[PDB]
Design a protein around this ligand. Structure first.
Ligand code: MET
Length: 521
């Protein structure tokens, strides 16, 4: 058994954080959280990509020192992610001195294997993307305010010509082995249609990669190539290596580096089990990264997951201002429920209220109040169930089956599908509780109401446990209301139906207390 290692991308610090950095780190955070509720060892990583030309020129364009500028923005991200109530284990910055150490270690390995040579790169380059492009991937446009230019087909950003003596990685030598890797491990890229993409790109053919830049081009704002101060190491090799760095750093209780281990095995994190990325940075993680790792004889990641968003601004959301107006758990829910891999989601104020009210408030929120109500649940107690009718069983079967299926969805990973799976069982429970009319049974058939109440409660409990990674603060409130002991709030033991025994007492109530309160109509 290993440490389960989940990563977000590390974000260029040229601009403040926005929705999107937050979405990316949310997925990373939710996966991590789910494996922790399974009781696994987890290490989730996130952070900032602070070197290179893009960022240098961002710092120049605001007339501030890049040493001061990267630190400033980096702090804004940290402040944003802290406000966003994630459970990330470490925040990593490429300016960190221990990271620089690993880049040089990694570089030397790449060199010693005979995989790096001194060449030229003469071709197109998007600075905003820090991406080398061939002429098939650029086209005319006017991203220059006035004048007409050539622009990236991927991003749309301005591309410029570069003719440099650069250090070159033999990425071309790694084609057939990448191709083997993708095939032998067909889950290694998710979603499937982006795996299909990568394999087409790599089967067409791979050129060598320009892993360094002339020192003056970058404004000297990059790590020096070992043994050649005239050169700076390509920001993306620098960036990608954060995953290795992070996997080697002992971190103290309050979240600060203390050591850099020599051997990545010592901490047991590497390779990343899941690399959460945005669709715009697929090639770096799915082609370049593996090929680097294969060269140095390092273990390949286990899977790369590219969501449908961009990682870097395109085209109505301040993350924290929205979480403050609508709710932190509801926002995270909404973002996870609404956006799939091919995306096309609707994020209007209408739709957020639609789901807040319909799903969080009327499906989930409502069930909790019925099954803890003073009027229905008269003794504030988990009752022992009597005999089960076939309907009782039918619903119980769903609740028994839910953890297994929700678990597979969580492992794909597909947080959307998982949330759908849980709320399907939730929807069933409401249907069940309508049919059964407990409010009528308190008076007519006390013995029946026991069976029903028990099933509702245990239904609400398990759905809630599988929703914990999405609604972390709100699951805690639900459990307190239900009176679930702390030892039952976590661990696959407690995926089992009937793990909280009858006799358990509910938590105290407040005269007016609400779990999710509807938004205006
Ligand atoms: C190590 S992932 C690097 C991602 C890059 N900094 C970006 O913002 O897209």
């Amino acid at each position: 058994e290993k440490v389960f290692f989940v990563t977000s991308p590390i974000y260029y610090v040229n601009a403040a954080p926005h929705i999107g950095h937050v979405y990316s780190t949310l997925i990373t955070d939710v996966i991590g959280r789910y494996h922790r509720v399974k009781g696994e060892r987890v290490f989730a990583l996130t952070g900032t990509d602070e070197h290179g030309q893009k960022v240098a020129e961002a710092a120049k364009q605001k007339q501030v020192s890049p040493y001061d500028f990267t630190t400033a923005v980096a702090g804004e991200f940290k402040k944003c992610f802290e406000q966003m109530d994630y459970s990330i284990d470490y925040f990593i910055r490429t300016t960190n001195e221990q990271h620089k150490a690993v880049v040089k270690e990694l570089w030397t390995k790449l060199e010693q294997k005979g995989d790096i040579y001194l060449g030229r790169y003469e071709g197109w380059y998007s600075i905003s993307d820090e991406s080398f492009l061939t002429p098939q991937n650029i086209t005319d446009g006017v991203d220059k305010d006035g004048n007409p230019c050539k622009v990236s087909l991927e991003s749309g950003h301005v591309v410029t010509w570069v003719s440099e003596e650069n250090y070159m990685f033999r990425l071309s030598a790694f084609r057939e082995r990448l191709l083997e890797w993708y095939h032998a491990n067909p889950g290694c890229i998710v979603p499937e249609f982006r795996r299909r993409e990568v394999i087409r790109a790599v089967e067409k053919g791979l050129p060598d990669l320009s892993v360094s830049r002339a020192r003056a081009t970058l404004h000297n704002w990059a790590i020096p190539v070992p043994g050649n101060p005239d050169h700076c190491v390509y920001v993306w090799l620098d960036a990608l290596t954060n995953y290795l760095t992070g996997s080697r750093l002992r971190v103290d209780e309050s979240g600060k580096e203390v050591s850099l281990v020599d051997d990545f095995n010592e901490l047991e994190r590497f390779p990343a089990d899941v690399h959460v990325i945005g669709k715009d940075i697929l090639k770096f993680h799915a082609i370049y990264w593996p090929a680097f790792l294969l060269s140095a004889g390092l273990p390949l990641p286990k899977k790369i997951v590219a969501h449908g968003w961009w990682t870097k601004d395109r085209k109505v959301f301040d993350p924290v201002e929205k979480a403050e107006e609508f709710g932190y758990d509801a926002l995270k829910y909404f973002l996870l429920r609404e956006s799939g891999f091919s995306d096309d989601g609707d994020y209007s104020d209408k739709n957020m209220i639609a789901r807040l009210n319909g799903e969080l408030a009327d499906t989930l929120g409502n069930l909790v109040m019925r099954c803890t109500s003073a009027k229905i649940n008269v003794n504030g107690e988990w009752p022992s169930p009597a005999a089960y009718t076939e309907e009782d069983e039918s619903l119980i079967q769903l609740i028994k089956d839910l953890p297994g299926t929700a678990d597979h969805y969580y492992l794909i990973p597909d947080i959307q599908k998982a949330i759908i799976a849980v709320f399907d069982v939730l929807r069933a429970i409401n249907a069940y509780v309508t049919d059964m009319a407990p409010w009528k049974l308190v008076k007519t058939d006390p013995e029946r109401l026991r069976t029903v109440l028990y099933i509702t409660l245990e239904g609400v409990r398990v759905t809630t446990l599988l929703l914990s990674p999405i609604l972390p603060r709100k699951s805690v409130v639900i459990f307190d209301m239900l009176g679930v002991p702390e030892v039952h709030r976590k661990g696959i033991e407690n995926f089992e139906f009937g793990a909280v025994p009858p006799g358990t007492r509910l938590g105290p109530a407040v005269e007016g207390e609400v779990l999710f309160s509807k938004r205006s109509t």
